[PDB]
Amino acid sequence: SWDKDVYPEPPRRTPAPSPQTSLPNPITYLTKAFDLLVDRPVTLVREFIERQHAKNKYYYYHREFRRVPDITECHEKDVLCMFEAEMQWKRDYKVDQEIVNIIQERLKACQQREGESHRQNCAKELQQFTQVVKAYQDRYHDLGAHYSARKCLAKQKQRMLAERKATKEAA
């Protein structure tokens, strides 16, 4: 199972079979054959496997990371704090990458699910993809292969300086 909220799916509406001709379609017969010959043995084997699982149950946990001070409250050339800030920034970088991957999965799933009318029915997914791509590009792009927290901070400082200059020239 997964989470229906972070991986949404619109409600399904299957129309009822209302045949017109008297010829029996082979799809129903092959579906019955698949349900008899294939589905029941696989279900029985999986039920036996789950019964064997239920005797010995053990848990694995999601690792929780507490918050450490970031690079903006680290002194210059003091490794014992910029180290922790750097690793926290790397973990946040990976989390952001997987967030963009989740949004890409949402967009592709919407495009394939909605069929030939995908241009109108998936505007929200496209706008969320555009917003998250703009945020990712403004946050992490053009850092280089040797990226660090200091390079991202310098890029952000340049961005706010340019924004302040632009809003000063317009007022």
């Binding site: 002194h75 210059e76 200091r150 390079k151 901070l153 310098a154 890029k155 400082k157």
Partner: protein, 120 residues
Amino acid sequence: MMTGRQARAPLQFLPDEARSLPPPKLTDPRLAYIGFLGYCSGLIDNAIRRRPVLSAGLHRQFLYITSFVFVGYYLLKRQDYMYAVRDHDMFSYIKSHPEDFPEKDKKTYREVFEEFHPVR
């Protein structure tokens, strides 16, 4: 360098200040490496005189590694003493002249400015 330091009491291998330092252990890795140097010397001495290199003259190899360990231990004692002297003199000069070594502020990265050069 420290020649004037070796001016009042010259030609001393280990002065009276060298005894306040902890002596190196007998299981020092450098001492083991010098013993291995002595073993290699014994092997070469057996080899260059057409002797069986792993059997001939075990007493010779034992004296080789023993003399090597002896000289290496004393040289390591002198090296540790000299490095302690260097550190002590440096710290004494730093303490003696506070105006020549003034403390500098540690500005956080929220205040300092770094230029960003994009890679593209």
